[PDB]
Amino acid sequence: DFDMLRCMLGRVYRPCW
Amino acid sequence: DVQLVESGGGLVQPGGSRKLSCSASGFAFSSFGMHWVRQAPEKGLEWVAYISSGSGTIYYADTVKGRFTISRDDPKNTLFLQMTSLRSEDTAMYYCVRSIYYYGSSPFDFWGQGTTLTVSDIVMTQATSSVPVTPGESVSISCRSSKSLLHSNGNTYLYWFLQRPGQSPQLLIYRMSNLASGVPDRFSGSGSGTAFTLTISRLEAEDVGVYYCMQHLEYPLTFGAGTKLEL
Amino acid sequence: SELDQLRQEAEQLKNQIRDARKACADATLSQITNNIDPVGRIQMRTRRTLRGHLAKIYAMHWGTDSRLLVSASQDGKLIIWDSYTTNKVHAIPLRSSWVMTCAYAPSGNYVACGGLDNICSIYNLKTREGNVRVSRELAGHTGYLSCCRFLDDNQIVTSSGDTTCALWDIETGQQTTTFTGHTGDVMSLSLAPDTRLFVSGACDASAKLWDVREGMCRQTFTGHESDINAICFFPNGNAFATGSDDATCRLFDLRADQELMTYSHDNIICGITSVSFSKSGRLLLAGYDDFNCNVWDALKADRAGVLAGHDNRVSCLGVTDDGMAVATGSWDSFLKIWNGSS
Amino acid sequence: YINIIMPSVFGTICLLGIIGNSTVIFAVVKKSKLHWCNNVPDIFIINLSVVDLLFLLGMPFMIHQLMGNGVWHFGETMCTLITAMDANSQFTSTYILTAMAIDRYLATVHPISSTKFRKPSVATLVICLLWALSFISITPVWLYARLIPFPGGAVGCGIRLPNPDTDLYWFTLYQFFLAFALPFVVITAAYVRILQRMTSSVAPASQRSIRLRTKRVTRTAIAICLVFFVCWAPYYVLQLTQLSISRPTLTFVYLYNAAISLGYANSCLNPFVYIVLCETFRKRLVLSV
Amino acid sequence: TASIAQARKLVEQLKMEANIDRIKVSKAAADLMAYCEAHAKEDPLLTPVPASENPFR
Amino acid sequence: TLSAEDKAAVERSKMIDRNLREDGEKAAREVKLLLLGAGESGKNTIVKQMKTGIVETHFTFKDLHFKMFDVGAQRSERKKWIHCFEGVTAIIFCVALSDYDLVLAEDEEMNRMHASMKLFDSICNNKWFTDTSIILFLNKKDLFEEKIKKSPLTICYPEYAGSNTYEEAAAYIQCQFEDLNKRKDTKEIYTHFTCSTDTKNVQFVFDAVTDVIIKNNLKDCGLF
């Protein structure tokens, strides 16, 4: 239950640009 | 027949170099470990070096380590001893000795005729230098060791050799009790711990000579002073 | 006429033997040994594993010092093992790799082997040259060599698949005595402790007792339903046990001249390859095709234990002369040494 | 439904994959009786199951920041190590699966010449070398594995390249080339060549034995090339998709999470490929029981 | 005349085997049971020895 | 806690293991062939072109060493020593085509071809050779054609209904032997028509053995 709109790279997250 | 002929000895200058060769015939040379044993004039036997079958293990005596090198050529059945920086302490007759090691084998069974070189640690003690003997009488020879030669596997690593005058040493008793092949049954080896006895029942003319006890518990292999039997 | 009359006399003689054996079957070994306590469960652990054979092991034999043993494999290698240390003392390359049996001389100076080449080869272990050499090749059997046993350094008894056993003079290389009477391939033989008699089991499902010196068959023992593969004398020499393809072991007595006990279980449906006794004879150890060795109670015919440590058929086994250990060889190319613990 | 469907796939795959990998390990190890049991192809399969097991054991350590709250509970110290280990557990399985494919090419197209070098010592040497190459390949993974600040009070482990505007392209392509592109070409080329050279000219092609041999190797070679492709293409296809995409939507995020689950499926189905398509393995399994 | 020659040999062999002295099975069974009892203690497989006396520790 | 002599005992033992390993690797690269067949079936003619109790023959062909075992002299029971050859690369079985209208010298009532047919399925379906390929040689092909003109194949096979020509009789006999294969999935049978002057017999064995090696590799590699 969160804002699951984060950018991804591999199987981990990445900072959106 | 089993033969071991040594060559390369001769008169050398101090600080010089000499190459000893031991040619083997009549037995499986690659299956035997090989030793060099020297004998200073009017002195006892002194072990020099050892190379095992397959050349995997090499041992040297402290008095020659770093100056002497032992090597073998199995296809040619030749054993070598490269000596450098020869000193007056190296003046001795050098014997080539075969010894095979497996369960129940008899190491040091055959010795070479020896080659003469002239230059211009468990302690084995044989206090009795000479023993006057008469033929047909029983003789006992005593040997002592600083350490117990009985190993935890049950073997007592004491060897007996006889060097008749003018001849190479011959194995009589190996591991303090076993009788070597070709040796008359009158010879018997008895011992316990550090004190050992070689019994010669019904002595004969051939038995006259010097008897040496050698330890094979650990390296370096050391010899006793030697006990001489005279008529 | 004459042939018909003679074969009728054989039936009368066979009935006379059967009646004579039935007369002396007053009691059963089971009834006699019913009162005695069982040996319990026999638990043996693998003390040593001998590795180095690269094919099926077909035979092994202990030396009389209970420390050295020889094993035969069809990788063409006869290997002598120091069982205490697992050191290989010798590795003898065989001229013919199809070896089926091997023997250790009681003196320890010789080993023997032979197989489908119909030859018993004698190897000298104590030579001044430091290598094992062939001293004799004993030719004369017209079938494969199935078993061989030394009597001394000069005499050896061999059984062959040509239905005959032979006694050989090793020095001259000639068979002094030939033992005939089996109608099938003789698969095994066992020497009596005094080496004056030996029993052989053949593929005619019969066991014969032979006189070594006289050279004739003394007694014939029947009762198995298929080929006998293994045979072993009881330690006192007055009995022997057999193992057959019918998944049974039977204990025959020489003096009573009949079977005393059968060692079988309903779960066991595989053939038996090797049999041996413990030092006291109370245990009968048998190797099986089901990859296991079952320890039987000889007196009570109860399965005392199982030696399960092989991935193929246990082809051979033997118990030391001092009774300290038992070795089992198998088609999985490994030998294992077993004994119990207090 | 969204909060229960995604955990269900991961839970089912993790449990099914553990049982399947355990069966392969149990059968191969226990086939003998306390004896060394290894072979040049038998070395690869047990090694593959181990790397497949590590990739599945570490599954919760990488998916806990995707299901409930997107919060990394292992800190920065484990952020670099777990990600490097997880990437190694994925990369190593690819390298083991690829090298095992070339090994089978050697034993089929070169039945005589390959006996000189298809030795257990060489097989051990290659596998030890395969692990080393994985560390070189995952070098950027652990060098740039630092925590990422999310809006709010939550943070998460991730990759923070020094120049994310330009460095994003090489990271995506190099993993695509090393872990998906090159190994798939090597594996596919190796197995199609085996299918063209799996029988002899003298062999009785009319006999059912040859035809049944042709069928089984064909369906085993196809499945291995298909399982690897199916279970990894959508994961890496999206990698090229997101190079020119800046703002993901809910549909894209759901597909990426479903793509990750297929990634753990490859190491889940690899043990089942050996169980099903290798008739020899069924007999070996019974021996243990 | 091979069969007729073999028949005489087979009949003669059965005569030798039928003329041997046989003891009772109870007598034979007792001797085997007696031998095992007398040698029971010196059987390491039947009665395992202490580990100090076991060459295969 | 080894002594100076026990250390040298182990070094000898490890030297022995080093030679056993070296010998086993050389043995694993060689092909073992068990040669079977009936008497006067052309088995010895095959050996003559590939130059005690068991006769073992060695030859090298295209960087491959073959060990061929002849056990024709063993008159003992086969089931006792037939398991010794469990694990050979392939079994070469020799069948005389011409021995269909002939009868056994001893039995005088059993057809020679049926003796070979009964012997083939005894070995082919044997439990030790469940997965062992068989190289079937149908020898005396040229002599078979001469007899088929005068003596029809109906003498051997009454149920046979075909042309009395070599091209159909020889193919019919080949199918009769291959029909005896009780497990047409775990093993394959390579059939070759040899003769007294043929020179391609060794090449057929090499081609068949090459296929046996491939099939065994696929079993090891897990592809099969």
Distance in angstroms (rounded) separating the CA atoms of residues E45 and E10: 43
Which residue from C145, C138, C144, C99 is spatially nearest to C122, judged by alpha carbons? Answer: C138
Q: Does C205 touch chain F (CB under 8 A)?
A: no
Cα of D92 vs its chain's centroid, Å: 7
Question: Any CB–CB contact under 8 A between E1 and chain C?
Answer: no
Q: How far is CA B154 from CA B191, C60, C324, F196, in A?
A: 13, 27, 18, 69
C290 reaches D (C-beta below 8 A): no
Structure tokens at D53: 């097991």
Return d(Cα C111, Cα C134) in angstroms, integer: 10
How far, in Å, are A11, D105, D273, F179, F223 from residue D214 at the CA level? 39, 15, 18, 21, 10
Cα D186 versus chain centre, distance: 15
Neighbouring C-beta atoms of residue C292, cutoff 10 Å:
19
Cβ-based neighbour number of residue D9 at 10 Å: 16
Q: Are C261 and C277 in contact (CB under 8 A)?
A: no
Contact F210 D112 (CB under 8 A): yes
Return the DSSP state at B88. Answer: G
Q: How far is CA B222 from the centre of its chain?
A: 9
CA pair distance C65, D200, nearest whole angstrom? 56
Q: Token pair for residue D261?
A: 């689950």
CA angle, corner F3, sides to E56 and B182, nearest 5?
95
Residues in chain C: 342
Cα(B140)–Cα(B150) distance, integer angstroms: 21
How many Cβ atoms sit within 10 Å of the Cβ of residue B33? 23
* D165 shares contact with chain A (CB less than 8 Å): yes
Q: Would you tell me which residues 151-190 of chain C have a C-beta closer than 8 angstroms to some C-beta of chain E?
A: 181
> B118: exposed, middle or buried (C-beta count within 10 Å: 0-12, 13-18, 19+)?
middle
By Cβ distance, the residue of F191, F211, F224 closest to D217 is: F224
* Cα–Cα nearest to B4, from B140, B127, B110: B110
Q: How many CA atoms lie within 13 A of B175 on its CB side?
A: 19
In three-state secondary structure terms, C139 is coil
Token pair 């007999």 is found at D283
Distance between terminal CA atoms of chain B?
A: 33
- Residue pointed to by tokens 């995506």: D172
Single-letter amino acid code for the residue at C287: G
Chain D, window 123-182: residues with a beta carbon less than 8 angstroms from a chain F beta carbon: none
User: F-side interface with B, Cβ within 8 Å?
Assistant: 1, 3-9, 11-12, 15
Window 19-48 of E: residues touching C by CB (8 A cutoff) are: 20-33, 35-36, 39-40, 42-46, 48
Calculate how close chain F gets to C217, using CA atoms only, in Å: 22
Gyration radius (Cα) of chain E, Å: 23
Nearest chain B Cα distance for residue C68, angstroms: 9
Question: How far is residue C5's CA from residue C16's CA, in Å, rounded to a whole number?
Answer: 17
Record: contact D204-F217, CB cut-off 8 A:
no
Q: Could you tell me if B158 and B152 are in contact, meaning their C-beta atoms sit under 8 angstroms apart?
A: no
Interaxial angle between packed helices D208-241 and D164-175, expressed in degrees from 0 to 180 and rounded to the nearest 10: 180
The answer to whether F and D touch (≥3 CB pairs < 8 Å) is yes
3-class SS of residue B78: strand
Asked if D18 contacts D77 with a C-beta cutoff of 8 angstroms, the reply is: no
* Nearest residue to F88 via CA among F101, F72, F71: F71
Tell me the sheet residues that pair with B39: B45, B93
On whether any CB of chain E is under 8 Å from the CB of C191, the answer is no
The CATH number that applies at residue E24 is 4.10.260.10
- The residues, any chain, with a CB within 8 Å of residue A10's CB and separated by 6 or more, are D87, D141, D159, D175
Residues of D in contact with A14 (CB under 8 A): 148, 158-160, 164, 168
| Technique behind the model | cryo-EM
Q: Which helix (H) or strand (E) is B69 found in, with range? A: strand B68-73
CB within 8 Å: D207 and F185? no
Angle at F174 between CA F173 and CA F180, to 5 degrees: 95
- Per-residue burial over D184-219, b = 16 or more CB atoms within 10 Å of its CB, e = otherwise: bebbbebbeebbeebbbebbbeebebbeebeebbbe
3 state DSSP class of F44:
helix
CA distance B160 to D273: 70
Which of C47, C279, C280 has its CB closest to that of E56? C47
Compute the radius of gyration of chain C from its Cα atoms.
20
How far apart CA F74 and CA B164 sit, in angstroms, is 60
Residue B101: list chain F partners with CB under 8 A.
Answer: 5, 8-9, 11-12
Min distance D187 CA to chain A CA atoms (Å):
23
CB neighbours of D170 closer than 8 A, spacing ≥ 6? Answer: none
Q: What are phi and psi of E35, to 5 degrees?
A: -65, -40
Structural domain span for residue E51: 3-57
**Residue B193 φ/ψ region, left for φ over 0, alpha for ψ in the -120 to 50 degree band, beta for the rest:** left
Q: What is d(CA C86, CA E12) in angstroms, rounded to the nearest whole number?
A: 53
Residue C88 near residue C52 (C-beta atoms within 8 A):
yes
Task: Report the sign of the C-alpha dihedral through residues D119, D120, D122, D127, in that order.
Answer: positive
Cα C1 from Cα C286, distance rounded (Å): 48
Number of CB pairs, chain C paired with chain D, less than 8 A apart: 9
* Alpha carbons F122 and C328: distance in angstroms, whole number: 32
Tell me which residue of B173, E11, D252, C166 sits closest to A5, measured CA to CA: D252
How far is C128 from E15, CA to CA, in rounded Å? 53
Is residue D144 within 8 Å of residue D159, measured between CB atoms? Answer: yes
Q: Measured between CA atoms, how close is C54 to chain D, in angstroms? A: 13
Span between the terminal Cα atoms of chain C, in Å: 69
Measuring CA to CA, which residue among F86, F76, F87, F53 is closest to residue C96?
F53
Q: Is E24 exposed, middle or buried (0-12, 13-18, 19+ CB in 10 A)?
A: middle
Q: Which of C21, C32, C317 is the best mutation test for E, with the most CBs of E within 10 A?
A: C32
| C-beta atoms of D213 and F218 within 8 A | yes
Please state whether at least 3 CB pairs lie below 8 Å between chains C and D: yes
Q: Are C270 and C284 in contact (CB under 8 A)?
A: no
Contacts of D201 in chain F (CB under 8 A): 207
Whether the CB of D164 is below 8 Å from some CB of chain A: the reply is yes
Pairing of strands C206-211, C197-202: antiparallel
Residue of chain C with shortest Cα separation from F57:
C96
Q: Hey, is B223 helix, strand or coil?
A: strand
d(CA D278, CA D42): 13
Tokens representing C308 are 């399960």
The closest alpha carbon to B150, from B175, B172, B121, belongs to: B175
CA distance D194 to D108: 6
Q: Return d(Cα D129, Cα F147) in angstroms, integer.
A: 66
Spatial distance between the Cα atoms of F66 and F50, rounded to a whole number of angstroms: 10
Residues listed for chain D: 289
CB contact under 8 A, C131 and B26: no
Name the domain count of chain E.
Answer: 1
Please name which of B108, B115, B94 lies closest in space to residue B38, comparing C-alpha atoms. Answer: B94
Q: In angstroms, rounded to a whole number, what is the distance separating the alpha carbons of residues C324 and C336?
A: 14
CB contact under 8 A, C283 and E35: no
Tell me if there are at least 3 CB pairs under 8 Å linking chains B and C. yes
Residue D214 — left, alpha, or beta (φ > 0 → left; ψ -120 to 50 → alpha)? Answer: alpha
β-bridge partners, C274: C287
- Is B27 part of the contact surface with chain C (CB cutoff 8 Å)? yes
CB-CB neighbours of B66 under 10 Å? 9
